[PDB]
Write a protein that binds this ligand. Structure first.
Ligand code: SAH
Length: 204
């Protein structure tokens, strides 16, 4: 069925607009987003407590808040300063969270993480060369036994949203460097609410 979304000149403005909503991306108020988060957290916790976690793309901190109590240390990156601002207010009781306003394309640490969560973010990149670059970066920052928990709207949905690729395409690329340990589908009320999540292990 046909649908309507806000229309902007670039991805920065798209992000900035959602981050100015009371509930960005409806991540608090949408039962589908809550169920997605349940799956995302179930996958993240599959191996128990995390030593050094990374969250890539935090919106207003809805998932950060669910993840934080289970990581000894948590780092959170987001290309939008407004996302860091909203999320760190949400998680203020925790003293073990670090933040950086950076694009995943530009993020370079010597840090290795035993969990990287990358959900509903990689389709904002402009093309497949950027996705690969970001994926290589994520693979590089995985600890020798660590897991990567990925989630995304499907390819078709992503293409309807004006983006280049979604879940199936990224899973394919992820699989060249990493070992798939599990996956889950997540479906809501419409074609737009149809998500694939997969948990990958670093064969290392
Ligand atoms: N290239 C990029 N690098 C880092 N963060 C990005 C980014 N492109 C978009 N983002 C951020 O990714 C977030 C997407 S909303 C998804 C949030 C969370 N992962 C969840 O599943 O609920 C926003 O905070 C947006 O600002």
């Amino acid at each position: 069925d046909p649908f309507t979304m806000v229309s902007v000149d670039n991805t920065y403005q798209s992000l900035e607009r959602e981050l100015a909503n009371d509930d960005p991306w409806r991540l608090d108020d949408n039962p589908f987003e809550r169920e997605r988060h349940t799956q995302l957290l179930r996958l993240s916790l599959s191996s128990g407590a995390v030593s050094n976690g990374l969250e890539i793309g935090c919106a207003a901190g809805a998932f950060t808040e669910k993840l934080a109590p289970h990581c000894k240390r948590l780092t959170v990156i987001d290309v939008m300063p407004r996302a860091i601002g909203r999320a760190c207010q949400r998680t203020k009781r925790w003293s073990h969270i670090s933040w950086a306003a950076t694009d995943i394309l530009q993020f370079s640490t010597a840090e290795l993480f035993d969990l990287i969560v990358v959900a509903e973010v990689l389709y904002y990149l402009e093309d497949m060369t950027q996705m690969r670059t970001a994926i290589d970066n994520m693979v590089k920052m995985l600890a020798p036994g660590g897991h990567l928990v990925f989630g995304s709207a499907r390819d078709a949905t992503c293409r309807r949203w004006g983006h280049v690729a979604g879940a199936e395409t990224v899973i394919t690329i992820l699989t060249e460097a990493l070992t798939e340990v599990e996956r889950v589908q997540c479906q809501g009320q419409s074609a737009d609410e149809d998500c694939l999540l997969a948990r990958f292990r670093n064969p290392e």
